[PDB]
């Protein structure tokens, strides 16, 4: 059978993909899937930043 790595190879293609998702936006969190709570809080912070301005 193909060795385990055809698991890894898809995963590493995915880890490369995930790295790009984060990097292009400049963020650790691009989606809730990176951090569900970091996201919800930053969305609140955004209303605070804009409302405050």
């Amino acid at each position: 059978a193909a060795i385990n790595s055809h698991r890894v190879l898809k995963f590493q293609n995915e880890e490369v993909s995930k790295n790009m998702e984060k990097l292009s936006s400049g963020m650790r969190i691009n989606r809730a899937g990176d951090d569900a709570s970091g996201l919800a809080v930053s969305e609140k912070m955004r209303t605070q930043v804009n409302g405050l301005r």
């Binding site: 059978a1 193909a2 385990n4 055809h6 698991r7 898809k10 995963f11 995915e14």
Partner: protein, 53 residues
């Protein structure tokens, strides 16, 4: 995506299972052919001599 990794591991292992359950090592089965072919050939020639008896 985590679920997919789980499924992919089971997939590789299941395919390895099919191979090990059904697929023979061609090298050794080929050895069997050679032994059996020789015995066929030995049969053929000696029956020609058996006819002489």
């Amino acid at each position: 995506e985590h679920a997919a990794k789980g499924l992919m591991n089971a997939y590789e292992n299941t395919q390895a299972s099919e191979s090990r359950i059904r697929d023979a090592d061609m090298a050794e089965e080929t050895v069997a052919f050679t032994k059996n072919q020789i015995l066929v050939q030995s049969g053929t020639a000696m029956l020609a001599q058996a006819n002489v008896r």
